[PDB]
Amino acid sequence: KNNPVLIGEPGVGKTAIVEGLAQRIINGEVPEGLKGRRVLALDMGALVAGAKYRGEFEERLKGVLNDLAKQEGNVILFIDALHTMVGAGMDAGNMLKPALARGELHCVGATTLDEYRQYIEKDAALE
Amino acid sequence: QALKKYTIDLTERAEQGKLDPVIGRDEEIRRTIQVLQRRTKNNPVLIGEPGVGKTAIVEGLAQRIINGEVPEGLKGRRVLALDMGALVAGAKYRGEFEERLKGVLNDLAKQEGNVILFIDALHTMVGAGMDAGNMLKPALARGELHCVGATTLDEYRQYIEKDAALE
Amino acid sequence: QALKKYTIDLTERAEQGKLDPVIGRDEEIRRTIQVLQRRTKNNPVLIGEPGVGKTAIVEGLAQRIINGEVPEGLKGRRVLALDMGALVAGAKYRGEFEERLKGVLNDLAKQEGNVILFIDALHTMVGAGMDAGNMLKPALARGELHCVGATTLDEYRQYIEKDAALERRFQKVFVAEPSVEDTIAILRGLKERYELHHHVQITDPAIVAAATLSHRYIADRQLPDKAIDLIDEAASSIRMQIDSPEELDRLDRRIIQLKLEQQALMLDMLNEELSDKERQYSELEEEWKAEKASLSGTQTIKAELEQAKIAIEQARRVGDLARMSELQYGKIPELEKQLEAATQLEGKTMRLLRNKVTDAEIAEVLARWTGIPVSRMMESEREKLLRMEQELHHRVIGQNEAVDAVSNAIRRSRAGLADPNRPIGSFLFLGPTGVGKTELCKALANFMFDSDEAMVRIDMSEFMEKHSVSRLVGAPPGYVGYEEGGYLTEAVRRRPYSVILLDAVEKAHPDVFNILLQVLDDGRLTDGQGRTVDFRNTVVIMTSNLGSDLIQERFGELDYAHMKELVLGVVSHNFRPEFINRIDEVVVFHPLGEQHIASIAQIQLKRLYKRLEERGYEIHISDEALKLLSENGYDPVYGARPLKRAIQQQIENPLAQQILSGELVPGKVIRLEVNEDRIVAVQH
Amino acid sequence: NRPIGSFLFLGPTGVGKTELCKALANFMFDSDEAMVRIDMSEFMEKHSVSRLVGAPPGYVGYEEGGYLTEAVRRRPYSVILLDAVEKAHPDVFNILLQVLDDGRLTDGQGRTVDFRNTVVIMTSNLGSDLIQERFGELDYAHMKELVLGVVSHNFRPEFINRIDEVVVFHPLGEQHIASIAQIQLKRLYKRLEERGYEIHISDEALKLLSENGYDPVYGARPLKRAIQQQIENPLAQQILSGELVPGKVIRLEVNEDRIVAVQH
Amino acid sequence: YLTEAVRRRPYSVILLDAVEKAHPDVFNILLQVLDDGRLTDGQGRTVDFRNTVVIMTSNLGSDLIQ
Ligand SMILES: Nc1ncnc2c1ncn2[C@@H]1O[C@H](COP(=O)(O)OP(=O)(O)OP(O)(O)=S)[C@@H](O)[C@H]1O
Ligand SMILES: Nc1ncnc2c1ncn2[C@@H]1O[C@H](COP(=O)(O)OP(=O)(O)OP(O)(O)=S)[C@@H](O)[C@H]1O
Ligand SMILES: Nc1ncnc2c1ncn2[C@@H]1O[C@H](COP(=O)(O)OP(=O)(O)O)[C@@H](O)[C@H]1O
Ligand SMILES: Nc1ncnc2c1ncn2[C@@H]1O[C@H](COP(=O)(O)OP(=O)(O)O)[C@@H](O)[C@H]1O
């Protein structure tokens, strides 16, 4: 269970708390295992803005996932709107599924209260 | 092959010790070994409130397969964990998902009644897009598949008790 | 194509022998072929409550098409199993459903009636998001399709008798449940099938007992599906107990424990003990391998026997001359006699247990389902019935006559001499109030099936109105309790093997006796919701007090016979002749004596010492305190509940107050010494 | 345009009213409860009329129909039995006015169910007192006349005009009671031979049964429970005693005041 | 009022204010409470009371207090 998801009502500063975690990474108030990590927010927009062909979107997304496996867990990934993330293109988040609870992928969730009850605890395959 | 593409071998992970030492649950593994060896109703579904390790009950069954602590007919089975999520959306065509699942089912016909299949959240097998129910409703009665379901009571009471050609 | 994409070619499967050769069902196959050889409306539907083998009727029809018992209007026909779920679940869009279904109808009309279309679960076709009825309708009318439905009767009358056009497109073939003997014959064919799979044997007494006790007890599922459930589940339990060995596991744990002990000690003696236990383990292991080899040879020779039977059916289809006589006269009797030689060999050698499913296995499986003492009088319940007087006087002191009567009643019932439409036994408890009416009720519910909790007590004193009657039977439709259930009938339908205990039926309204007339007449009490309630497994007991003063004032120097006749006359003045006419055996209670009161006090001391020893105290009592309790707890008007509240107020209130005061110490002998008016506890 | 019959079985209780109708069902469909039995002591108020026909549209029990019309729309040919037709309220049988008149009955959903093939039998015990008092020294015709006058005091003359025939049951006589005992012993023999035993009786035991079950006021059930007790208690007592061995003739011989079974 | 609230809330405390204005059937109900706590309504639901606290009031000895 190496993937915290944030559950809050919409507009209580979830992205703010993730960026505060990022500043404490920069300021060095964290334990030594997190000193030197990289916080990357996944751009949804520029991926879609040039897509035309069969899975070339997911080709780019899988290339980013292979680069994250190349970075060997030294990069703490953060993708907000997690209920939107599960379907965004095998589609967008269950490509990821074996890499999550193995020390490879550490995507940090941050999503709404009701949409947690929609698309996360019902979808028990990743629960 | 497609088993390398879309399944998770539990027996290789327990073979290399990646899984967990399952403690207790002798009675439920007993009942599973009963229901796995019948001639009809040959597919259990592990039913309880979620997060009680139904996946790990199947995994401990796989560990007892590796450690030889099963009855004789199970000595030599292969437990495979088919993901509902791994299969979905490589498809722009009109049913490439169905093509890949058909290739998987032909591979399990090729393995000749040996591979025991694992699926959790079996309601996703019912409705996910023919998608996974009626492509397998033949194979859930033609003896080419020995699926082990895992779901909560609510999805069993709705999406399985109703469907009388699955019930 | 389309037909290979969606349907399941059943004739190819029956040609590959993957089906069940279902014995019997000759009239339903005849009536299905009568329907299928018409000109218009060629569409039989197979209707019955689920489990009865409507799918098996269609498969047996396909096997008769393959073998050729059909007339000359079905030979060469293919039978195709359309899957209604496999056409709906792709349609996201406008008119992709009808794309598939028109593809299916064009390919079947290209076959030109050569393909009997088979549709299981036909009530999926109607309401499935206009959809599927209104394309099949011009083909089902003109007979150019050959649909065969398969549906439950409830879904039939709900999803088809509604829509009358698709009602007349089809034709009914009413399929009934098989008989008990037909269930036995079916299971004999299926025994000959199943002993190829589970590697075991089945003894035909277990088959007939399985069918009979499944028909007797499992009242939700129906034949033959429930009998096949029992047989297969016992076969799987025995397939467990092939490799369940326990003694090898005990010997292996023993040798590894003594191995660890001897390796830690390195006086010895344990090399010798370990060598003896390893020799015993090796002998048991080799015996286990010998049993496994015997069962393997038996399974292989049984499989060769069944393949020989399939091959002589191949010779019956094809028509080779010497192959028939050769396969029959050689292969059948020698393989059967050495199959029985392997059977008696396994009876000799199975020390490590069973490969033959006996009736006890069926009893264990059905007990895991429900928990009835399923089998017959097994000399544990039978000797309980032979000492049923003693068993009832284990908990109920006194009242010998009613104990004898109730004992005789259940002895009549369990031997099968009751009139099997009536309930097990009607009873009219009379006499003094509160002696053990309820204690005999609890004891009877206890030594009938489980305990005191398999009963329903109903205070009949509360029912004194017309709408009270409409409560306890159930409110008629269009009214109130029809929403929220009946009272008595729901309590029986939750607890089908129970005891109904009324309370002061004379205090009820003077019409509830008529509901009881229906009860004691035939034990069907059709509720408000219009479904029958079956009393034939229960025991109805009624309590009263119409001669309590009559019995208490005249018990001196009057026997049981004059008392019974006198109270029969008095009850005839109170009640109606029909009501007492329906009774099996009116019993008569007698008042209590003080030795019986002392015995009740003894049983209360037993249960209280049990509860306080669970609490952790060792308490003794003087018999003078027992005499004070007996004198302070009896009256002619109330009986033994004065003794109960006297025990409560004089022990359970003050002594537990002395315990909660930090006075008493657990473990000490606590003699309940007497006072002038009370009972004092000491610490010795 | 009527049902096959429509009857009104009167008389004192337990003279064979219900078993005549069960005798019909065992002739016609070869089964005892192969019939429809409307136990009319539940219908003591008019909302139970709404039970039997089915609840109207816009109410609770709409989506199920009645019980009667559902029963007969399944089986068009049956024997509809209405036992105890005067414990019920006097205005219940107006449903049966329509039934006996034309064989059509309208349920809740609005479908007329065809009663042109059934037999409506209503078994009363209104005339019990008058028949028990005056069946001596009176013929059959004036007895039927006078008890029919009593029924006319109970009912309205709409309904009894529909009836195909009212019959009158006479109270039982002693040789009839002996034959009742013989019939009960025959079916006891049948059920115990299915249990697997060889059981006979002495006629003296039958005489002692007839001398321990006679009463004109109660008809036949004291004979039935006398047979029940004074045969089945020592018989099943020796069954559970294990004294009975199959393959042995069992003559139910007399005791001094009882009946004993023997092993011979 | 009384029975169905325990079926809604089996985990609570019960009050019966102004019990001086009662009726003997209520006294029978409360003796059934103080005996075992099990009590069934008119339509067949067995309801347990032993996990609660029951409190009553009166206002005549209260007037003696005043
Ligand atoms: N601890 C904090 N310190 C400073 N500013 C904060 C803090 N928490 C919240 N805020 C402010 O509140 C804003 C909320 O931003 P978001 O995290 O995007 O809101 P949200 O709760 O994430 O809702 P969404 O889903 O992002 S629209 C931040 O951008 C800050 O301006
Ligand atoms: N005459 C028969 N001989 C052998 N097996 C039979 C026979 N009738 C039924 N069965 C078995 O009963 C099982 C299912 O019976 P069915 O009557 O097919 O139940 P069903 O048709 O599925 O009913 P539903 O409504 O679909 S649940 C199968 O294993 C059949 O082999
Ligand atoms: N035998 C066991 N001993 C200890 N923990 C177990 C055991 N089996 C399962 N678990 C725990 O259960 C968790 C898995 O929950 P699971 O039952 O698979 O999910 P679901 O809620 O979908 O049924 C694992 O984290 C595992 O640690
Ligand atoms: N014969 C007996 N043997 C043992 N205990 C009995 C006996 N008779 C009565 N009791 C006790 O006497 C009490 C009688 O109460 P109950 O049976 O409810 O009243 P009633 O006698 O009016 O039916 C029961 O609570 C029971 O504990």
Author numbering:
A (entry chain E): 199 to 287, 293 to 330
B (entry chain F): 159 to 287, 293 to 330
C (entry chain A): 159 to 287, 293 to 407, 409 to 430, 441 to 858
D (entry chain B): 595 to 858
E (entry chain F): 661 to 726
What did the article's authors report about this structure?
We studied the disaggregase ClpB, which contains tandem ATPase domains (AAA1, AAA2) and shifts between low and high ATPase and threading activities. ClpB is composed of tandem AAA domains (AAA1, AAA2), an N-terminal domain (NTD), and a coiled-coil regulatory M-domain, which forms a repressive belt surrounding the AAA1 ring (Carroni et al., 2014, Heuck et al., 2016, Oguchi et al., 2012). ClpB activation requires two signals: (1) interaction with the Hsp70 partner chaperone and (2) binding to substrate protein (Lee et al., 2013, Oguchi et al., 2012, Rosenzweig et al., 2013, Seyffer et al., 2012). Each AAA domain extends a flexible pore loop bearing a conserved aromatic residue, in most cases a tyrosine, which interacts with the backbone of the threading polypeptide.
